Amino acid sequence: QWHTNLTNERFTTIAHRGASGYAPEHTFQAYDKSHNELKASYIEIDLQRTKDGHLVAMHDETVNRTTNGHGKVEDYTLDELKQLDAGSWFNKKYPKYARASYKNAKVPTLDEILERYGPNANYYIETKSPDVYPGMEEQLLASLKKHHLLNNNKLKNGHVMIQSFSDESLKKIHRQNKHVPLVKLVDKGELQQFNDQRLKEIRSYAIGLGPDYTDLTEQNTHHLKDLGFIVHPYTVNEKADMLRLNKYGVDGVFTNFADKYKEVIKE
Ligand code: NA
Predict the structure, then answer these.
(1) Which long-range contacts (CB under 8 A, 24 or more apart) does 188-196 make?
(2) Strand pairing partners for 197?
(3) How does strand 230-231 pair with strand 55-57?
(4) CA–CA dist 212, 209 (Å, integer)
(5) Which of 12, 135, 211, 259 would disulfide-bridge 186, Cβ 3.0–4.6 Å?
């Protein structure tokens, strides 16, 4: 009597920032790997916006960590951002997975991503506060619609899952389009902090809940599942934990190693 992934999968494999563990996060390389090669359930995307308003995939608000550049993403125009090298940094940090082709990987725009993997892929997109990038939500939905991902059919098959730590952002989207599946990202330790009334309300606009995996235990997991939630704890890269969590009853996980999780599911 619980809820199961809209993709109709008992266990969904969310490729955290793409094939994050083997390729430079948020790059065609990383996405190609997790989607084509490892064949993971979702292409997980983190949104940031350029100076001239282009939604692009990048985890931090600054290009420092993942490029040969410095500054806030919004200080760069899409054109300038495209000059950056979004791959080299990966070779240097993870020599054991390094690859010559990773050099000069580019930062992708949300449009390019949807464009590239088409309307049959499944996307897990994250938004920031309605104050940090005003208009982000309206833009995301417009982009999704452009790429035919807002069709009700696609929506109830799990082709789209919008996630965020900002209740404000999710609520804004829910008002604008009640049909887009929403996932509330819970912070580390924050899961405990909120009671049933809280969960009850979160559940009024979000079908899913994505807590830090370390805050999960078989009991709360069951409880959440009971409250009608779909649970996708985040960034589980250890087979051991993958197995444990699956036993608790989760519906999938965010991971930088799609294959490890898919194998744990196979067994
Ligand atoms: Na994320």
Answers:
(1) 188/212, 188/214, 188/215, 189/215, 190/215, 191/215, 191/216, 191/220, 192/220, 196/227
(2) none
(3) unpaired
(4) 10
(5) 211
Resolution in A: 2.6
Domain interval for residue 259: 1-267
How many residues are there in the chain? 267
Considering the candidates 3, 59, 148, 222, report the single residue annotated as catalytic.
Answer: 59
Non-local CB neighbours of 139 within 8 Å, separated by 6+ positions = 49, 53, 55
**Catalytic residue check, 16:** yes
Calculate the CA dihedral of residues 227, 222, 163, 253 and round it to 10 degrees: -160
Q: How was this structure determined?
A: X-ray
Cα-to-centroid distance, 17 and ligand 1 (Å): 7
CA distance 26 to 166: 21
* CATH value at residue 101: 3.20.20.190
148 is catalytic: no
Please state the domain count of the chain. Answer: 1
Q: Residues near 256 by Cβ (< 8 Å), separated by ≥ 6?
A: 16, 17, 19, 20, 21, 235, 237
Cα of 16 to ligand 1 centre, how many Å?
A: 7
Cα separation values, 146 from 45, 112, 115, 131, 212, Å = 17, 12, 10, 24, 32
Query: CA gyration radius for the chain?
Result: 18
Lookup: tokens for 195: 């009671």
State the distance from the centre of ligand 1 to the C-alpha of 234, rounded, in angstroms.
9
5 CA from centroid of ligand 1 (Å): 19
From 16, 159, 174, 232, the catalytic residue: 16
